[model samples]
Target: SVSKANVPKIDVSPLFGDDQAAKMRVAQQIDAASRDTGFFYAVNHGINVQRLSQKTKEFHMSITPEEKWDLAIRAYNKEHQDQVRAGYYLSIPGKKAVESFCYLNPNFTPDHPRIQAKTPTHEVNVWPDETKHPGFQDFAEQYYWDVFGLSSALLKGYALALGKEENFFARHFKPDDTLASVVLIRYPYLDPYPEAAIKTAADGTKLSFEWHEDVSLITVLYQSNVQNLQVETAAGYQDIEADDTGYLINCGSYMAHLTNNYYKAPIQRVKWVNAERQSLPFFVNLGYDSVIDPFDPREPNGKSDREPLSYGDYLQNGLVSLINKNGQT
Candidate 1:
């Protein structure tokens, strides 16, 4: 069985030390791991557990399955109405479905659903009516701030890990232009469909999310003990037995570019098998205008011609293409 001892841990406290030796140790660990796996478990990173737990409880208590269904239906109707009036509406593409929603921004042109928004990252996020769900807004606000802090720390760590000074990556991330989103997804059990129409793999397990990689720089995922998350590793598609105190950190498309494709994109998915699962995944990306061309003069190798593209553009185009190709949109 895979355990914490089996997985590598990077202690970050030394990064805060005043001595040069301690600082060097932090940089060495970052460089070695970034060159090798491009992934590592971070401890002593200083996230408030009390805040996380309180917000988690609030999230759990905020809604029920029936309430979620109600909200989904309501959102669908609102979008349908807008589509009938306008020519098109914004779409929220999911695992195997295209969920349409009313464009929240009045300034959005009918043709600009794909255009990146210029509002605060939190402003773009839509929440249920706080009047109905009291304290929902408060909980969400606090959660977003906490997660944002964690993400900032992770980005700094990535900079150090890459043999660069701390905040090397953070400098490129503009507070307003950066697009970050936290999703609270609940995957419930589904009844079996007709045998004639049902499709199963040779292994006999029904697939939930099709094979795909994330579009952001990194995705920090926190899941319950219930086992459904799976990853395609060297062995094969294996169940990810999540550590209680550790979150699953995976590389995304842009991060793949940063490492010059040294780290592979892990094909991942959630399987449905008569069990309930809840997960909170925090996704971070560089600002819409921030260039991903590794050719910054500040780096060790001066400049690189790897590629030049905005992280938001990469995510919007890649994800939309994937959804449309799968006939989900």
Candidate 2:
């Protein structure tokens, strides 16, 4: 029953205002979008989109490194041919090329209890040498905090929508201990794609990123002018118009798991395009040791509808599964 659908633009400014009615209305609007489309344009989200986006573009243009690290500021640049096969999007091979910089919260230090314990998501960030990058480190860290604020606000709206107190989800998201990550991705222009490398999807769209769901609770994505992003709807894979004034928000598999499937995560992909594009996605995650139940408000005895799961263990296994699926192990 997949058909064409439109991604709605919602004004979330009221979430920060003092209007109770407006706040409730926005919550309801978010609830509707989450249930019906699982995606929306979160406008008036209070982030300086233009400033942050410009910095992102500048970073990509200035730096070029392809390295990997865990829970730190890592630069990963993939050339056209090699990146196409890096992910396991389909049973058959895929041809998607992308460059990205990954970063986690910068608050953790070497002497921090979590870092000392060698926690998976609580590791200290590996920042670039300040002498080489200059002010880029500061810019990236500020952007992280800005986006973190917005993500925390949205979580409150989600709580109100699901009939919980405003701080219901807050308990699981510690300012320094959360596993939230920010990734700056660049898809270079491929005017004339290799005929043999491209793999068409079932819907007949030529993909550059391939079909997949993000491994986050929710992803706040800022796109720098590209119309290639598409999401699965009741109709089918429909285009999500890019908006520079705001962020495109979508539910992820982890959110679905938390809500016991009440909010289904949308599947999305990027189509091959001639123009270069940049995407800044802040992936919201819970604290590494936060225990969650598929059914919220688990019993006092620590029993829920299903066995409780720790966010850290879930993330660990998910990454392993992805690597194993791609035959990279």
Q: For candidate 2, lDDT tens digit of each residue in 3-71?
A: 445678889888777787788888898888988878888888888888887877776676533323221
Least accurate 10 contiguous residues by lDDT in model 1: 97-106
Cα deviation at 109, candidate 1, in Å, is 16
Q: Estimate each model's TM-score.
A: 0.71, 0.83
RMSD of each: 6.5, 5.7
lDDT of 1: 0.54
Instruction: Name the candidate that leads on TM-score.
Output: 2
- Pairs that collide, model 1: 30-161, 295-304
What does candidate 1's lDDT look like per residue over 1-329, in tens digits?
32111234677656545565665676666555545444455667565644554555565555554444344422234532222111111223222221221112222332433334432221233445677667765665666666666666666666666656777777775544456555555444334422322225445656555567777787766666676666655545666555545556666778767666655556665555454455666777666567755544345665666877776567668656665653342
Where in model 2 is the C-alpha error above 4 Å?
1-4, 65-96, 191-197, 296-304, 323-329
